[PDB]
Write a protein that binds this ligand. Sequence first.
Ligand SMILES: Nc1ccn([C@@H]2O[C@H](CO)[C@@H](O)[C@H]2O)c(=O)n1
Ligand SMILES: Nc1ccn([C@@H]2O[C@H](CO)[C@@H](O)[C@H]2O)c(=O)n1
Lengths: 208, 203
Amino acid sequence: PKPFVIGIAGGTASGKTTLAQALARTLGERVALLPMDHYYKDLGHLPLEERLRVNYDHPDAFDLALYLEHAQALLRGLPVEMPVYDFRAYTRSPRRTPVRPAPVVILEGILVLYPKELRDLMDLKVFVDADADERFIRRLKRDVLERGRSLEGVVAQYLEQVKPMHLHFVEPTKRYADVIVPRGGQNPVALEMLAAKALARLARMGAA
Amino acid sequence: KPFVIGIAGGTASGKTTLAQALARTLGERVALLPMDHYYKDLGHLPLEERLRVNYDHPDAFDLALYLEHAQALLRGLPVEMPVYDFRAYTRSPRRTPVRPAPVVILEGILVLYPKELRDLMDLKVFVDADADERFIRRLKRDVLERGRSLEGVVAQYLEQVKPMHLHFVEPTKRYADVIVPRGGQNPVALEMLAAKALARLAR
Ligand SMILES: Nc1ccn([C@@H]2O[C@H](CO)[C@@H](O)[C@H]2O)c(=O)n1
Ligand SMILES: Nc1ccn([C@@H]2O[C@H](CO)[C@@H](O)[C@H]2O)c(=O)n1
């Protein structure tokens, strides 16, 4: 049948990635996860200095056409070759990774609830919430330890782009969520609840 | 042991209608105890004094009786629930029976405030809605159902309801496992709470 389509959005470092991955792990082979943060437009032909200036928190930085195409293919029972973005080099990497069709599809990303075309594919819409100061702390650690950023560059990107875009584009999408999940990285009860809903949907698919 | 769900939120947040809708959905599988019917019996005080009482402070509630009844429901016993009269500012001399059930719902603005109540819950829900929208619903309900004047609602809201919401209610949101918006009309959140309750029922 139709998969269960779950959209999970939230600000940067809100716990949304960890929650989606945990749900994916709880369901095993019955889930396909498509992270929108790997779908930035391929601007690899542009010099680094130009890629450094792009605002990666504005909707137009994303290859929405491709993301939507992949989600639609998964919905038809077809596999897709998912792009992989290189946060260190600031470009779409040459690597790709296959994603197998499954009865539950999870679309996760800071802006997955922004485009009506994406929201119209979703059966369940989740927004993962956490205060900006706590998210900034996790973002700063993530950037310095995994993405080769300096503390100074993180502060500048955050104040000049991440925060303004979060207030203008990300936070208002919270109004479209069916449920809001706090403590996304460590919330066993909320995880069990999302899992129970998906399991009821899966049981519906096999029963007749 | 019955599955216990606590559902808090500000006044007119939609928590009451969400709590009642879950109950309909699960039929007799649910026993519901609204904490707003548990205000302390202050019938001995003069009317004028009762009108000035702050009904949004935790100490206005008869927590001892509420806790007592929650425990009795958990041991599989029925309880005699008090009924509060919002027009008369008084606990009714008559009570109403609540039968035990495998799912118990505790709902109220301050149900997540006492640790004693929180420790009893398997799932904690906070129903969120902005204060301006809640005030709109609170003003309408008070005038049409509780004999309040518009001026009376405004004074009670600014002098007590709002300050207590900011001081006691809103901070309890940090104890919730899930936050539910548009609690008065949220089909998906309802189906999801029901799905979790049925799973715990099967065990
Ligand atoms: N080249 C890039 C591309 C994206 N990002 C950050 O990734 C976050 C969304 O996952 C976004 O918040 C965005 O700031 C980044 O830091 N550098
Ligand atoms: N005699 C009373 C007792 C309670 N209340 C209001 O009931 C709300 C909680 O349901 C609380 O917000 C409280 O203000 C009221 O208006 N008058």
